[PDB]
Amino acid sequence: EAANEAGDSSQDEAEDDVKQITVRFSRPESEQARQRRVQSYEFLQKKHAEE
Amino acid sequence: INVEIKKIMKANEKVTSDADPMWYLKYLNIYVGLPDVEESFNVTRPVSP
Amino acid sequence: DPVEIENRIIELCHQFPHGITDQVIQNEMPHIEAQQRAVAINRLLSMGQLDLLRSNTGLLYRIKDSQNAGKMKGSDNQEKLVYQIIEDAGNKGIWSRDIRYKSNLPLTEINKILKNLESKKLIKAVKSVAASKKKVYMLYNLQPDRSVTGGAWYSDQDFESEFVEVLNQQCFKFLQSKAETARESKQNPMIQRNSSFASSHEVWKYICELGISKVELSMEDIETILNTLIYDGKVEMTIIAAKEGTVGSVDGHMKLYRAVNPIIPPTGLVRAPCGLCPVFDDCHEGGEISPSNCIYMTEWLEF
Numbered sequence: 001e002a003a004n005e006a007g008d009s010s011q012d013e014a015e016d017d018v019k020q021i022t023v024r025f026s027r028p029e030s031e032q033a034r035q036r037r038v039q040s041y042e043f044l045q046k047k048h049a050e051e
Numbered sequence: 052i053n054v055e056i057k058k059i060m061k062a063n064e065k066v067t068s069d070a071d072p073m074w075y076l077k078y079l080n081i082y083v084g085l086p087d088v089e090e091s092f093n094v095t096r097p098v099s100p
Numbered sequence: 101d102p103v104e105i106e107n108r109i110i111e112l113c114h115q116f117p118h119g120i121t122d123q124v125i126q127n128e129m130p131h132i133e134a135q136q137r138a139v140a141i142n143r144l145l146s147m148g149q150l151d152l153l154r155s156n157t158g159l160l161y162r163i164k165d166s167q168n169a170g171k172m173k174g175s176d177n178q179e180k181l182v183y184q185i186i187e188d189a190g191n192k193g194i195w196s197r198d199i200r201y202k203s204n205l206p207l208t209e210i211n212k213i214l215k216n217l218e219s220k221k222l223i224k225a226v227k228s229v230a231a232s233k234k235k236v237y238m239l240y241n242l243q244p245d246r247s248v249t250g251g252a253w254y255s256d257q258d259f260e261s262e263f264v265e266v267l268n269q270q271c272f273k274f275l276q277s278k279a280e281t282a283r284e285s286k287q288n289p290m291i292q293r294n295s296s297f298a299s300s301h302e303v304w305k306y307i308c309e310l311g312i313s314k315v316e317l318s319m320e321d322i323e324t325i326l327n328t329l330i331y332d333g334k335v336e337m338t339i340i341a342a343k344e345g346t347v348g349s350v351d352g353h354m355k356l357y358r359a360v361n362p363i364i365p366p367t368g369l370v371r372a373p374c375g376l377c378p379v380f381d382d383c384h385e386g387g388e389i390s391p392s393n394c395i396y397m398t399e400w401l402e403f
């Protein structure tokens with residue numbers, strides 16, 4: 001679907017979509033939010049996949 | 052007053068604020084004591100029902 | 101030894117502050133396979149000493165800004181972990197409240213960081229003219245954007261109503277004189293209309309020659325002034341097709357302004373006190389507000 005959206009036109013001009021530097025703050029996460037992240041399913045799945 | 056109060060105090064034994072870390076208020080042990088009356092100036096006194 | 105690879109990559113980044121591609125690293129160190137270089141770059145990014153950029157030429161690895169230091173008292177960690185979004189904001193600036201909320205730090209720590217950064221000339225605090233609530237912090241090297249601060253009309257966070265009024269009056273007088281000259285020429289209707297027309301560049305150069313104020317007024321400023329005049333119902337603008345000329349502002353288009361008289365004189369409703377009455381809704385035959393004992397009509401008939 002993404003490829004179709006891109007090929008909506010026959011010839012696609014060179015897009016000036018340079019990746020601006022969107023480096024986000026490594027904000028200090030609250031202990032509650034950190035525990036929520038640790039208890040999240042994605043974190044457990046990634047930890048299992050690390051092996 | 053002898054068991055459940057201690058468990059409730061232990062559940063909230065530590066309370067701290069997000070700003071200015073390394074600051075905390077830790078509860079150690081809670082007591083109820085005997086019935087008293089605050090009539091006297093800054094002094095307690097046994098009072099009957 | 102991957103430590104030597106990381107050290108060499110850091111040295112190469114030091115040599116090129118703008119960043120280095122994988123081809124440069126391969127040319128500088130050809131005896132190392134691509135997998136080892138990839139692992140080294142992954143470790144460098146994990147430990148937080150490199151940043152990745154996606155340019156039209158590919159990927160660039162740049163050393164993180166650590167040499168540029170304004171707040172060395174304490175730890176450079178918070179220094180850079182504030183300067184990061186300070187730079188990200190850049191021209192548009194950012195209020196102290198937003199910096200605090202993005203840093204998740206108390207007010208005292210961020211205040212200290214900002215003061216120490218201002219001490220060594222890394223950030224400048226300018227008053228937000230749009231909403232004068234707090235001072236936004238920007239990079240000292242970047243030019244302040246006109247929208248968030250500054251402007252030809254705003255002077256010290258104060259709108260100059262007198263300045264815009266004088267500009268409008270002078271532009272209207274110039275356009276009226278031009279239209280009068282065009283009408284008096286009476287050479288040909290088309291020539292008359294073309295002469296009564298005034299291009300934005302012409303009126304801009306005229307205002308510049310007048311020199312009412314010291315601040316430099318760009319062409320778009322005079323264009324906005326003429327648009328405001330049009331909104332006043334006193335002038336008319338037309339977009340003609342012209343490829344290139346002394347203006348060269350818009351591609352193939354030129355805006356010509358001319359003083360035009362109103363459509364109709366004041367109507368009859370406004371000539372009666374009833375049409376300009378602010379308590380017209382409460383009008384009633386028998387009551388406190390009655391046309392018989394009206395003060396507006398009384399003063400209007402007495403005058």
Ligand code: SF4
Binds near residue numbers: 374379380
């Ligand atoms: S107060 Fe008199 S003049 Fe004013 S709107 Fe009423 S009737 Fe008309």
